[PDB]
């Protein structure tokens, strides 16, 4: 099924970890798991409902990393007048996505903050 500690849903194995890491450290932690894994992704409402069902005993309420980083990077940015975005003057900040251990809603956070996370792999 799934090794010890891991839960099964829809052909995949999931594990929460309640120990605060930044987004980048979290992703690599998952990577370096005995079964190589990634930050949990959501492909459906039902899967999100299942993962918060998992989180709730374990991780309540901590903010929990999901697998989305640099969420405001590759937007198709354009001037309203239709002039070229040639000169560029951005800030200096990277946002990543998380949810509370208790609800399905997502929250944009500075990637360098520290919370908890869930790993996921295909079985």
């Amino acid at each position: 099924d799934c090794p010890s500690g891991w839960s099964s849903y829809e052909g995949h194995c999931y594990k929460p970890f309640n120990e605060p890491k930044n987004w980048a450290d979290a992703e690599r932690f998952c990577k370096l798991q005995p079964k190589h894994s990634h930050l949990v992704s959501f492909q459906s409402a039902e899967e999100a409902d299942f993962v918060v069902k998992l989180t709730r005993p374990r991780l309540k309420a901590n903010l929990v990393w999901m697998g989305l980083s640099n969420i405001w990077h590759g937007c198709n940015w354009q001037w309203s007048d239709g002039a070229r975005l040639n000169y560029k003057d951005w800030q200096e900040q990277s946002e990543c996505l998380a949810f509370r251990g208790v609800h399905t809603e997502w929250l944009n956070m500075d990637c360098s903050s520290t919370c908890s996370f869930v790993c996921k792999f295909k079985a």
């Binding site: 990634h38 992704s41 959501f42 697998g67 969420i71 937007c75 198709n76 001037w79 007048d81 000169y87």
Partner: protein
């Protein structure tokens, strides 16, 4: 230049005006269009213009204790957020968003120069840009 309308300030081939009225980004764009010829929320295409727009705003005293000032930057977009794949490499299908930061603004704390993505439905002062005519 000088061939600007009253209320408008020249700089380099364009006329500019900061309006202290607080509008959502969209309301600001529409307001600018309606100060026709073809006026739009400002585009910043250079260091000199950034410096100019920044000086224009600082100069407006009614502006005001104001955190943000809309400019004409908006993402196109199209999804609810811009990261097109999860870290596992799969594409972003289901999305669960919530206010989103898909419009660009200048910020008080950053000297009205550096650009900040910010929530489009937030009401703020804005700068329009126009081609003399």
């Amino acid at each position: 230049l000088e061939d600007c309308d009253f209320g408008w300030s020249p700089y380099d081939q364009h006329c500019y005006q900061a309006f202290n009225e607080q509008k959502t980004w969209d309301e600001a764009e529409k307001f600018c269009r309606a100060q026709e010829n073809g006026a739009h929320l400002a585009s910043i295409e250079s260091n000199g213009e950034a410096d100019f727009v920044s000086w224009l705003i600082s100069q407006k005293d009614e502006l005001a204790d104001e955190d943000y000032v809309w400019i004409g930057l908006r993402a196109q977009n199209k999804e609810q957020q811009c990261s097109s794949e999860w870290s596992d490499g799969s594409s972003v299908s289901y999305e669960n968003l919530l206010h989103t930061k898909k419009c660009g603004a200048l910020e008080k704390l950053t000297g009205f120069r550096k650009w900040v993505n910010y929530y489009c439905e937030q009401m703020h002062a804005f700068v329009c840009k126009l081609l003399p005519y």
